[PDB]
Amino acid sequence: ADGVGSSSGNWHCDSTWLGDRVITTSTRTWALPTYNNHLYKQISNGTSGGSTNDNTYFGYSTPWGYFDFNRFHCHFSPRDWQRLINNNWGFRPKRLNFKLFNIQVKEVTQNEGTKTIANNLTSTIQVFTDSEYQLPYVLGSAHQGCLPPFPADVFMIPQYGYLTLNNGSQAVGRSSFYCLEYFPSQMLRTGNNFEFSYQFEDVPFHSSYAHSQSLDRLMNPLIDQYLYYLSRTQSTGGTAGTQQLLFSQAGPNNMSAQAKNWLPGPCYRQQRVSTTLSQNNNSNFAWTGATKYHLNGRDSLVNPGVAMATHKDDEERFFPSSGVLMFGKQGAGKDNVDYSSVMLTSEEEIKTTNPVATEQYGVVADNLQQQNAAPIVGAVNSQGALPGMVWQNRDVYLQGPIWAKIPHTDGNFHPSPLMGGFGLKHPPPQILIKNTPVPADPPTTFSQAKLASFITQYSTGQVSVEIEWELQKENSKRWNPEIQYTSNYYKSTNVDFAVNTDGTYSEPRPIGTRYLTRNL
Amino acid sequence: ADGVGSSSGNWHCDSTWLGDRVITTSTRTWALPTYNNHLYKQISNGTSGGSTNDNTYFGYSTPWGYFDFNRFHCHFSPRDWQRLINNNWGFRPKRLNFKLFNIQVKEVTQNEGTKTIANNLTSTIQVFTDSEYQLPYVLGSAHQGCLPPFPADVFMIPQYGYLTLNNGSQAVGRSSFYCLEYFPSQMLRTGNNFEFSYQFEDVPFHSSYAHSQSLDRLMNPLIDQYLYYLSRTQSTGGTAGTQQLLFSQAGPNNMSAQAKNWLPGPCYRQQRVSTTLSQNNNSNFAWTGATKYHLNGRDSLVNPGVAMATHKDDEERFFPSSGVLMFGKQGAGKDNVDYSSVMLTSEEEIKTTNPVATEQYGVVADNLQQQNAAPIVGAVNSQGALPGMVWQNRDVYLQGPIWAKIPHTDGNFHPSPLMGGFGLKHPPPQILIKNTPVPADPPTTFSQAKLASFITQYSTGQVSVEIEWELQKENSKRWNPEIQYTSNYYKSTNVDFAVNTDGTYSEPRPIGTRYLTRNL
């Protein structure tokens, strides 16, 4: 039986590779403080201050914290991630299991300048999952506070808050307020533990691979087509330019002119930025020249956007302004940090099926020609979905988000998250946790006012999350060797994906998921 | 039922990866000519000519050919070899299956200057396996004539011959002569096929991995040893050098002085050669300065020799003269070809457990010291096996031999082939094949002389070899990513391990089998 002298659970970290399943499991140590002195608070920012109209919000910050495991490096070691991306075409999550155990609640008190900390054995914490998704779902925005990548780290649990409809800083009539104490929650003392199990809905495998064929090269290089195209509108070789309609079969000589069954994926253009500083314009175009969308009078930057190739062949240095996911190196500031600190992801692999982010989708005619009027062709900067169009989703990264919640709406088009991930209508429920408030001594004469004086308190414990993953094994007749993800062979001051002299775990580079090839 | 109008078998090339087994299977088209005009012939080379005493031999060349599949690239595509070496610690062969089918026998005749070729439907070929190993076993010497690496190539079957005891060019009394027609053999016409199955004896897994620890670093870096060593024989800091015995515990500061349980593998020194030309001596030392062994008055070069590290840290350019396996690039001559054409293999990975090929094993004392006599320490160039000694075998390569036959002898020490491979007491039997001689028209009057006139004839057909391999899966708790074998990411004129514009299949580099790490 449970008690103060027996542990509620054991430490488990593994990856079990069996057949087409891999079961990854993680355990971390967390510390949950008291947020907002146990208060709900209205929070808002209006345009009255230096804030612009785009940055206005209205919402509430709660006392509650929440667990976020939504990043891959929570569930995978760099070596486990290497087994995955080298040997497999696809993977999808199946089920997860989640546990809290070994909970300590501790009171801390100040006397003059000295601090002291003592166990409080009778205190509780409150934990519930929102199984029914009745709360604003705050996961999937790529917020900080996930379990650390490295298992020996102890992390602080992030505070829960949410945003609601606003006009300026003020709230409208449809604005909702949620009291989290109004759900049923389990209360745990130091001998109690918490568990639940969740099963993922059927979701398509993330495709981890690149195409070994571009979309326009699917043809046989040897053979002509029986179809014809319009090769020349004018008389050739004549002393007069008299117009004449001449047709030709497209063939190995002109492939660009052949008939084709499919079209590249949709395009929404990004502004191109060069890593070489001299090539860029001299100005600040970051916000002004940015690609934005306009929703209810507020312009929101489009980030990262629809999945589009970062750059074309033999341009390494150019990247779309908002187009790529950008990760920071260990110990990087939050504000105006130099380029050397960020790690730019790149989509190389989707150049085959997807247009380049920084270039036009194509060119269409602007006019009806006449013998008098010359033909005019305009560029297509943004192109929605057309029939016969194929595309790839953005690639997941070891540092990136696993899933997002598909908004509940009448309709959606290809509901896959633009940060990359698995779109889920019923994602893993978000787990909320709070220290139960313990009052400081009340007065001896009754007063109606609520008690504003509490014992300063925090809790720690252990958390285990276990996800079963389904694998799609690579089966390929390719003769020559694949590209693999490999560590650098040459010597270095310190090992990649390992602690340094000071004990700081760092991740050198973002690791994409597609090294394998398939036929398009 | 079989006949001239039905095929005897089907084309099969696959690698089936299932569980801990991989079954590789290959099929090739072969052409078997008539060797020695259907004659056995004595062959010898004596010292009377320009030949030296080391190059003398006595033996026989037969009419027979033989099939040799003994190289890995027969059974593995470069991609199948990549799955193997990246994902696995070890592998060993289990059983094989072998087939001849779709046999054509063709007669060719000359009329004036024109050639013509026609099927001969009634002719046979003779095939037997030496199951009992009663013949000189000629496989495992790394001779040419193996099935081509690339399945679309048609290869010529090599002629069978063997060597026997000699004195000079002359034969001694123990010299043996073998008539191959004196075994039972199966005779096949164009509708017949041949098959047999062989099962490998239990053999240790080839170890494909490197050690992540050197043999001398197995210690804990944090903690001292309770053992002592002799640190100083002389008085320190004194105005006199009076000798005094001072002892110390070895620790993190001096690791080289700690007590250790094990010793590096055995050493037989090689001469060191630099790829930089200026650094080498100016002379021809290739034969003279070579490391040789002396057997019955003949000096034989030691090649490649006992497994030893090619070079130490931060020397790329040096290699042992005879120490490394040397493969040629596609289309390289057989004689005095330049360095650019050969591909030098290297053992990097065994630096941990094995001494460097070009350096001394260690140093031992040459004398008993006295107050009068100074201590003298000699180098150990060659070192046999000592108790408490550990070593790694040489690495197998995609281009290298799979197995060798362990000589039948009273005793042997660690019977593993020095070219690398699996030492087998009962290796796969060698398959012998010959065109049955068909006489040209005999005279109409009887003559006792054997018939010297035959119909010029050759045969072609298909050959399938199928080997089941047992795998030892890699199970490792290493956090950071492994080194993997990967193809080059950058653009190139033509793909590696693929045909060029002219249709010539080439292999760019030798591919070793050890990219994974284990703890020593």
In order, the DSSP letters of A497-511 are TSB-TT--B---S--
**For B127, phi and psi rounded to 5 degrees?**
-140, 130
Alpha carbons within 13 angstroms on the beta-carbon side of residue B251 total 8
Q: Distance from B228 to chain A by nearest Cα, in Å?
A: 30
Is some CB atom of chain A closer than 8 A to the CB atom of B403? Answer: no
Q: Which of A82, A315, A484, A517 to mutate to test the interface with B (most CBs of B within 10 A)?
A: A484
B505 shares contact with chain A (CB less than 8 Å) = no
Q: Across chain A, which distance is largest between two alpha carbons, in Å?
A: 113
Answer whether A484 touches B (CB < 8 Å).
Answer: yes
Query: Which residues, numbered 66 to 105 in chain B, qualify as contacts with chain A under a Cβ-Cβ cut-off of 8 Å?
Result: 77-79, 81-83, 86-87
Residues of B in contact with A512 (CB under 8 A): none
Beta bridge partners of B197: B97
Cβ of B490 under 8 Å from any chain A Cβ? Answer: no
Nearest C-alpha neighbor of B21 from the set B474, B467, B469: B469
Which residues in B89-100 are b (16+ Cβ under 10 Å) and which e? bbbebbebbbbb
Q: Give the 3-state secondary structure of B396-463.
A: CECCCECEEECCCCCCCCCCCCCCCCEEECCCCCCEEEEECCCECCCCCCCCCCCCCCECCEEEEEEE
Determine the 3-state secondary structure of B217 from DSSP.
Answer: helix
Q: Look at A479 and B487 and tell me if their CB atoms are within 8 Å.
A: no
State whether B496 and A479 contact (CB < 8 Å): no
Helix (H), strand (E) at residue A87 = helix A78-87
Give me the total of CB pairs closer than 8 Å, taking one residue from chain A and one from chain B: 78
Give the Å distances, CA to CA, from A335 to A328, A339, A342: 11, 12, 12
> How is residue A188 written in tokens?
């745990």
Residue B455 φ then ψ, to 5°: -85, 125
> In Å, how far is A20's CA from the nearest CA of chain B?
11
User: Chain B within 8 Å of A60 (Cβ-Cβ)?
Assistant: no
Q: Is there a contact between A79 and B487 if contact means CB atoms under 8 Å apart?
A: no
Secondary element (H or E) of residue A106: strand A88-111
Residue B154 contacts by C-beta under 8 Å, 6 or more apart in sequence?
B28, B29, B30, B31, B460
The shortest C-alpha distance from A485 to chain B (Å) reads: 7
Nearest chain A residue (CA) to B499: A480
Q: Residue A498 and residue B480: Cβ atoms within 8 Å? A: yes
Quickly list DSSP for B30-62.
EEE---GGG--EEEEE-TTSS--GGG-EEEEEE
With CA atoms as reference, the chain B residue closest to A499 would be B480
Which element (helix H / strand E) includes A383? strand A382-383
Nearest to A438 by CA among A122, A200, A132: A122
CB contact, 8 Å: B482 with chain A?
Answer: yes
Find the closest chain B residue to A149 by CA distance: B479
**Which residues on A lie below 8 Å from B88 (Cβ)?**
none
Q: Are strands A21-32 and A457-473 parallel, antiparallel or unpaired?
A: antiparallel
Q: How far is A243 from chain B (nearest CA, A)?
A: 42
Per the listing, tokens 């709406």 go with: A409
From chain A, the residues in CB contact with B480 under 8 A are 78-79, 487, 495-498
B-interface mutation test, from A15, A79, A81, A507, most B Cβ less than 10 A away: A79
Nearest to B510 by CA among B484, B485, B483, B490: B485
Q: Which two tokens stand for residue B175?
A: 């010299």
Which residue from B minimizes the CA distance to A81? B481
Min Cα–Cα distance to chain B from A498, Å: 7
Nearest to B483 among A81, A482, A489 (CB): A489
Q: Which of B78, B87, B481 sits opposite A480 (nearest CB)?
A: B78
B480, B487, B496 member nearest A495 (Cβ): B480
Tokens of A7: 């542990």
Tokens of A455: 């014992």
> From CA B321, how far away is CA B294, in angstroms rounded?
18
Nearest to A438 by CA among A38, A50, A11: A38
Query: Given its phi and psi angles, is residue B284 left (phi above 0), alpha (psi -120 to 50 degrees) or beta?
Result: beta
Q: Is A55 annotated as a binding residue?
A: yes
Distance CA B454, CA A483 (A): 55
Structural Rg of chain A based on CA atoms? 29
Strands B114-119 and B422-424, by their bridges, are unpaired
Is residue A58 a contact partner of residue A70, using CB atoms and an 8 Å limit?
A: no
From B18's Cα to the closest Cα of chain A, the distance in A is 10
Query: Shortest CB distance from A79 goes to which of B479, B485, B486?
Result: B479
Evaluate whether A436 touches A56 at the Cβ level (below 8 Å): no
Residue corresponding to tokens 């590249």: A264
Q: Which residue of A has its CA nearest to B19?
A: A19
Torsion angles phi and psi, residue B409, rounded to 5? -155, 165
Alpha-carbon span B123 to B226, nearest angstrom: 81
Q: What residue type is assigned to position A341 of the chain?
A: S
A478 — contact with chain B (CB < 8 Å)? yes
- Resolution limit in angstroms? 2.8
Task: Give the technique used to solve this structure.
Answer: cryo-EM
Task: Please state, in angstroms and rounded to a whole number, the distance separating the CA atoms of residues B83 and B87.
Answer: 6
Distance CA B181, CA B194 (A): 18
Cβ-based contacts of B481 with chain A (< 8 Å): 78-79, 81-82, 485-487, 496-497
B82 vs A contacts (CB less than 8 Å): 481-482, 484
Q: Do B79 and A478 touch (CB under 8 A)?
A: yes
Q: Measured between CA atoms, how close is B78 to chain A, in angstroms? A: 5
**Which residue type, as a one-letter code, is found at position B16?**
T
CB B392 within 8 A of CB B207: yes
Taking CB atoms and an 8 Å limit, are A86 and B484 in contact across chains? yes
Q: In B138-242, at which residue ranges do the beta strands (DSSP E only) sit? A: 154-156, 159-164, 166-167, 170-171, 186-188, 194-199, 206-207, 210-211, 228-234
CA distance linking residue B398 with residue B284, whole number of Å: 32
Nearest to A78 among B78, B476, B480 (CB): B480
